[PDB]
Amino acid sequence: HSTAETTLDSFFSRAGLVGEIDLPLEGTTNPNGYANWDIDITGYAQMRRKVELFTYMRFDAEFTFVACTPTGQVVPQLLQYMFVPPGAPKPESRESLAWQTATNPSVFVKLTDPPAQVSVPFMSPASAYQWFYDGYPTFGEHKQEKDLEYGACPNNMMGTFSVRNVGSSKSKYPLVVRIYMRMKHVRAWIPRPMRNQNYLFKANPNYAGNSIKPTGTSRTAITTL
Amino acid sequence: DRVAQLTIGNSTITTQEAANIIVGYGEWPSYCSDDDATAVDKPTRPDVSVNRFYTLDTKLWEKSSKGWYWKFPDVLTETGVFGQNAQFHYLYRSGFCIHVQCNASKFHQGALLVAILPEYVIGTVAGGTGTEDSHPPYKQTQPGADGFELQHPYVLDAGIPISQLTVCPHQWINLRTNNCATIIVPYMNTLPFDSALNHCNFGLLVVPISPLDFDQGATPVIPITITLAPMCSEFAGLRQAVTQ
Amino acid sequence: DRVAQLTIGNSTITTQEAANIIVGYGEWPSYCSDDDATAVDKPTRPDVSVNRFYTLDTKLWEKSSKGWYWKFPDVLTETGVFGQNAQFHYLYRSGFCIHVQCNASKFHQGALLVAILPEYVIGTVAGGTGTEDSHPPYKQTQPGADGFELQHPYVLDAGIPISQLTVCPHQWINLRTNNCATIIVPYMNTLPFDSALNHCNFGLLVVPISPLDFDQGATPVIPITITLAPMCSEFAGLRQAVTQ
Amino acid sequence: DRVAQLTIGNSTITTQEAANIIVGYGEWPSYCSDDDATAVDKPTRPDVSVNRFYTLDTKLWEKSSKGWYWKFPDVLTETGVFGQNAQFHYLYRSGFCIHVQCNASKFHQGALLVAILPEYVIGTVAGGTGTEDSHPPYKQTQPGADGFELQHPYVLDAGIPISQLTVCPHQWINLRTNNCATIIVPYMNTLPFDSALNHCNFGLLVVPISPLDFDQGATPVIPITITLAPMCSEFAGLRQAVTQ
Amino acid sequence: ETILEVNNVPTNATSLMERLRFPVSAQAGKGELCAVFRADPGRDGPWQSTMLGQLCGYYTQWSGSLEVTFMFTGSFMATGKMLIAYTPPGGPLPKDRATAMLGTHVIWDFGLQSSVTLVIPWISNTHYRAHARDGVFDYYTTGLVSIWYQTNYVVPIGAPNTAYIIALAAAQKNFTMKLCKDTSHILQTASIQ
């Protein structure tokens, strides 16, 4: 019996949803034809629980962007995706000058074309990404107001992902962009207990203290099935 | 094999009821390679003055104790010459030899799980309901030498099962078998050096899985003492002493 | 090394919690040289009939005991064939193998100092004030096999500190460690032979330095037995039996 | 021979107008022999962390200056790692490399006598009349790093002639010739080790024998800086830090 | 080795025999202090009960390491760890264990081997030491010894809650004395009759 399907690559090299961006016509969520998604794969439970089985992880990845309207309808619209590394100017509008991408990598696709796919390397200044960082990013007094920074490691903050309608006028259709990630060439260190409770937030392991459920199923008596 | 002696620096530990020695992840502490390093300044390797056994506070094991934990670079930052170097230097690096000791009698019983959990991040009960994004105070994330007591050991105060804590370098202190646990930990971090003040490489957990018990008349005070020694300590980036 | 057997004559002693053997002043008992002797008559060396283990009375160790002592040539002068020879002959000479035994349990505690004090001269309290030149009675200077109890152990009833009694061949009986003391003493005197009746070469002191203690329920009767065997016994100057 | 460089520890001194180097009493500092020592504990020889150049305060040479002095073990007892070791340890031992520097121009003039006086005991003017047995205060016998100024340089504030101070390891700073003096002193005392707090092995004297002078217009501020480095430092008898 | 009277407190007529040993018992677990004494051999105090201290009285100066062996006389079921520390000159009597442990010390574990030896290494500035007394001659002090509870005296039901320790002291092989003089005391008041 082969042990090949339990290698790290077999386990993690499967694309899963990690991001979802909305570009509606009318609303309070990115209604100006552009959006800035903070790159963080910690927003969805399935993908998150798997990677959080290990403390550190080094890997290249393959990102696929599936775009369409909220009904799943494919529309003849041209979009522009741009990777904005930390420090680069984040677009403030659909006609922002930042869309010139003289140096940032950008992808131009129509929703009628098959989902855009691209390869990304391991771009952390650390030797691996940390799903858990037990510490603070800066020195000084750590008062109540700044406890927001506990567990925040900049070595995991890879930047922003920006999207827009390639134009100067409002789009004729409402859009949605789902982001999938497939890990390749994976190295992993230090396994940990698997998530036990429901996830509540992105930057931390908070759990609902009043709804602490058992790891699994329960029964009436220990002497009866 | 039941008896052992640990000599390092000018300190020696003895034991006649040991249970072998665990070497975390099968690796002995070592100094930083010339190709794994970045800081260009020549580090200080004080040796014998910092690589020795430091005995921290003692805890009392009660029939109702939940367990305690100690963050490691931390526990020593205000003790001996190790602490001074950790304060004067920006960068620190080192392994540890942890020796938890607790003896009773052939009529007492109980079992302690002594484990090392790297990057032991503490979580909060989130106001009970789970709607309040509260965070653990400095007094709890870095308790110092006095350690801190677990409020919800089942989830290690971090939402993870203690039943799986054995995937980490550990050892047990079963009173009917041994009276101490010895674990040797190498330097573990994603960086060759790091701050001994802002970062805690790992946490030491001592938790009673099988409650302490005995009949009235047998001495009721059963202490648990923690002794630990740095290994292959290196410091760099000298400046004035900083406490935090 | 914790176990031992002492066989001499037709007697054998066994022990499983001993603490080695002490040979007083690093010398084994021996017979008198032809150049160290004066008495011209050929001595008697009865061997096996007198060089064997004689077990004298037993004492009871109480939580308040002060200690006891035995003068040696004396303790045996009225026992077995050794006593007969000691009475019929004017001159006597010999070494001794002293084995003090006292066992308890792993729950009892206490420490006895077993020492040999050569020429152990007894003094009196001098009427308390120290103005009366009184002297110890025959019953106290030569107590026989029943031994005698110390009234002021701190000064060994002779104005000398017991804290220094360890400069003499000694051994301790620490209940948590051993249950007996073995000391081998050579013949010590300024003469090659002497009277076994008028002179006592040395005294055996058994004194509790650390009080006996235990919890109610554990057997309260803890005896201390004295067994001793002459070695290389020689007698000369035969005549009728004299008691004193 | 006019140029020189003194490197020790992580400090380097440069000079292009030197006058050779003096080695006090023709002996280089050395560690204590195994036959000259008494203290049985193993000493600490921190090396590079304490054997380096420490630059103490600067003095201003005026046309009317009398001279200053510094007691040596003392000047460093509150500085760097040398000071820490001197405070934590009872016993101290070491030699010194003293480098006094003072530069001017080819139009300034004057001569300083830089000498080392072992066991430099300070006396008082005895109330002027000489009938009052007064004594120098702690602030004057052990002035620290700030040094102290001489009130009566002719007699070195100790009733001895400065004209004979040249029988001691010395050197001169003649502005038209050199701009610094270098003297290397071995450990001198009647004991192998001694307290760095209670005892001052020697004193450094910097005294103007030929007054400073120049014409108005030439820079009037002419500093005299003292730089010194311990050599072969050894400490023993560890305990808590003591200031005095 | 001869018995060192660390517990030189009782002066009562009936309580003299208890100066020969000091108590140890179940505590509260905060590294409590057990006993303390100066390491000075020829000085008034505990060492006066030892043969070494007595022979010293006959010499003006001494040199060398000293040793003190502590024998635990509790029961077999009693356990415990103590910290015997030696504080070289200058160090004031350590206020707590965390301060005492900074000097020369040894952690003693009670077990089959009843005793432990604290070696008071020869750590002096001078080659020889004259007898230390209060005042100026305190210059020749050797230091201080202090016993602390490393953990605690633990015992089962049925075993005594208080046990005693007996200290025995002597000199090492490098010990030497010089310059004969008379002992400080003369055991006589009036003519001896």
TrEMBL record, chain E:
Domain of life: Viruses
Localization annotation: Host cytoplasmic vesicle membrane; Host nucleus; Virion
Role, per record: Protein 2B: Plays an essential role in the virus replication cycle by acting as a viroporin. Creates a pore in the host reticulum endoplasmic and as a consequence releases Ca2+ in the cytoplasm of infected cell. In turn, high levels of cytoplasmic calcium may trigger membrane trafficking and transport of viral ER-associated proteins to viroplasms, sites of viral genome replication.
Protein family (similarity comment): Belongs to the picornaviruses polyprotein family.
Subunit note: Interacts with protein 3CD.
Name of the protein this chain belongs to: Genome polyprotein
Species the sequence originates in: Human enterovirus 71
